[model samples]
Target: ANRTLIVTTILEEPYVMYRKSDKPLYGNDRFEGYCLDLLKELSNILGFIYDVKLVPDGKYGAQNDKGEWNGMVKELIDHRADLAVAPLTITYVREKVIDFSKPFMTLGISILYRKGTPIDSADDLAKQTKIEYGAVRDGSTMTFFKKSKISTYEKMWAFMSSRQQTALVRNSDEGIQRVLTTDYALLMESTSIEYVTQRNCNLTQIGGLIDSKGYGVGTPIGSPYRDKITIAILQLQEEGKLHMMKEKWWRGNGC
Candidate 1:
């Protein structure tokens, strides 16, 4: 019960945000948000303390051409961390190498753009010459294109990166800003798009979801904590605590 767990995460609004303060703070005190609150509840129930830390490379975990893992996933895979508590999507490929708790939330890929973008779907954007759209390079949306069997997405990726109209972005924040400042669309997670839209009336999410997925807590393969973490998540859902926490952080006056 006195054991301290190292939990790795990414800096994402509503889910996890760095606390700004002149005074130095350590561990969980340095961060706060939906996942931070969830971690607090889990710690109380599971009787374990956790040290929250950001992923060293600031990536959400992706594999390179050499098949080596990086980011939060790499930390878990290398046993450098005990848990990964963030908005990590549960995927079949990642499942092969790591263990995930029952999904805490469900979401999907969607488009984020300024209001009145005059676009509805990926296909519509594909045909537009005056507007530009992009996804974060090396992120899941980008990875989706590289692995999808659908020719539409494959062609979509090719066109977005082509010299004729290059629109690839370095991250979601940049892509979202582009939407606000120019005639651009951003491919991002639906939950995040929803959160941002609530905070910024100038932004809006369009079209139905492109694919369905769930966010789950991650642990290394064969971790003994996976079952316990899953149990805690299930308990929180049954008591409606998870829903309350999400509402507190993601909605209301919009953080």
Candidate 2:
């Protein structure tokens, strides 16, 4: 454990990011947020030193048609990183390729639309053709819609992604921005949708969550540190530190 653990992550607001500094910061000193604090506590209790870095691709990670993985998941899969501490959701497909610590947070897919939009739910989208909706390309939300158990979602994905409609988006931010300008709705994680709605009154989340999922700390398969990290997380939860941290970051002054 003498070597520093290379923790790979992405810059997701209120989760992992660089804090404002008048002067340049270096190393782990350059970043701060919920994940950074979690990483620090894990390191402290586990007796290890670590280094934090962003994923080169800035993606949460997904497998392509060729079965090749990309983003933070790929980093862990290729052994390029020791851990991925980010808003990495724990999905069945991902769990097969990588190990996840106990879920630290739970969230679900939801709709983000501009205020006064007629669309309120998936059912509404199905009834209305003029209202266009989109999900992030290669994101869990897209994956969910493509392979959802719900028949309505399956059909909806087909319609939204068809050449006739052209509704796929590059990312959540783009989709959210698009909603502001057009009759568009974005299907994204409820946690992110909630965060955005808190700051932008023009944007609001409609409908109940479409699907529930957990966000877990990801590690390469068979990692020696998985159980230890899981234990640390449980301990923190019992101590209420995890809840406190979430409040400090997610509900702090920025919103």
Candidate 3:
């Protein structure tokens, strides 16, 4: 292909993780996950030869903000990467700088706690002066919970004072694992927490969805690729390949 496609990805387990065993993989280094499959399919349809490059999950978002294509969003704008093919959540803040394909998947914010943790509802934990929760720093869950002012036990006074209830983690996987051992820690959903907890078979998701979420393929706000990617997704959806991919990875849990 004359136009080289450099796709930037991250290593978020189950969603996008590195396969530890030695094996040659396509696109981005030795990484593998649902998003990898998405890229493979999209590339096949788009007729592009892409090389996947790993970006630090923590830095990718900010890099995108700076419009550095080598960085998450930057790669696209910088023409460093033809597209970002990962489980990237589409939000208004992101939309300001990049255009997104129609959401291919939906997710929500969920809380994961250690099996024996005394937390349940936001209220129950909020009511306790000693309990604390954690989420990925700079992640959407942290933004929403902090902004929503999650309360403990539904009391007005507790809600008023619950600002101190949360902790910041580096990323989603780290936060979830931390909660598995630490009674006071928690992780929130970038994807299905239940799916991850079941696979890890350790942590548990507390309460219901705290917020609704979805992910879209990102492009430079008005990039021509937006329409192409959207049509590709719809084509996959029509062929039922979308469902097949979801079943293989998400075990039919994704929507």
Candidate 4:
């Protein structure tokens, strides 16, 4: 009973990151931040061993959607991996399909743009004709962008560019990365953009928060683990572990 449970993850800095080096350490390359760290501690207290493995996030999603094999959420739904942990944001659509723990924390959708670009708000982005903005996919934050800026306020790069304003990306990681490298593009977040911007000095978050929301751990809709995760989160909060982890990661800088 001294073994560990393998959990799939990626190198998302601040929340999770690998040391900057040509040949980064594998296996031990994992570091959990925000809610994930708390979940690890909870697992320890509950007598569970976790083995972290770095994998392509896309592959995991594809496997999960297949519904028979194990991959992230599918692991939980199919009882393969003991748990799935990452920046797994809980959404209503996801909730209808899978259960999620209580919101471990609240995160507001913010914009990430290259420095020197003058953008202050959704309205500002909408007003400018030359600027091209981007969103990850169809969801709450994307919906907010569509509603607040593209739909109601102004065109906001919805049509000026050859492609549609809404880029159906697998996740925010790719969208933000594209924005960081490209001068003309900007990426919106369903959760806080702080994690990405904090690590990358070249990028900056512009415009006030587009939308405010919470993120929670996900499980199968009817899984008993859902309640357990929620309870563990509350207990972790009471023990001050949640704030401690935030302080460790945020380091006095507010998220």
Backbone clash numbers for all candidates listed: 0, 0, 11, 1
Candidate 4 whole-model C-alpha lDDT, 0 to 1: 0.59
Give TM per candidate.
Answer: 0.94, 0.94, 0.80, 0.70
lDDT of 3 by residue, 187-245 (tens): 46636575676666566777777667787887766778889888998888888887777
The root-mean-square deviation over C-alpha atoms between each candidate and the true structure, in angstroms, is 1.8, 1.7, 4.7, 5.0
Local accuracy by lDDT, each model: 0.85, 0.86, 0.65, 0.59
Query: Model 4: per-residue lDDT, tens digit, 1-255?
Result: 765765655454456664555765555443545535765776866666677655434333322244443335555565555555666656554555556778777777666777675676766666665666666554355544444533633364354333554444546667775675554455555244665567677777787665566666666567666678778889888998877877677654333
**lDDT: worst 10-residue window of model 3:** 152-161
Q: What is the lDDT of residue 117 in candidate 4?
A: 55
TM-score of 2: 0.94
Report the CA-based lDDT of candidate 2 relative to the real structure: 0.86
By TM-score, is 2 or 4 better?
2
Deviating ranges (above 4 Å) for candidate 3: 22-29, 56-71, 115-118, 149-166, 190-192, 200-202, 251-255
Worst lDDT 10-window in candidate 1: 157-166
Error of 2 at 176 (Å): 1.9
Q: Which segments of model 4 are wrong by more than 4 Å?
A: 1-6, 19-36, 54-71, 114-118, 137-150, 153-157, 160-181, 190-192, 196-204, 252-255
Per-residue CA lDDT of model 1 for 1-255, tens digit only, reads: 467899999988888987779999776798988899988998888999888889999998888999888988899999989999999999887888889999888899988987765577888877666787778877777788668778777777777768224488866677877888888788899989989988898888888899999999999999999999999999999999999987888787356
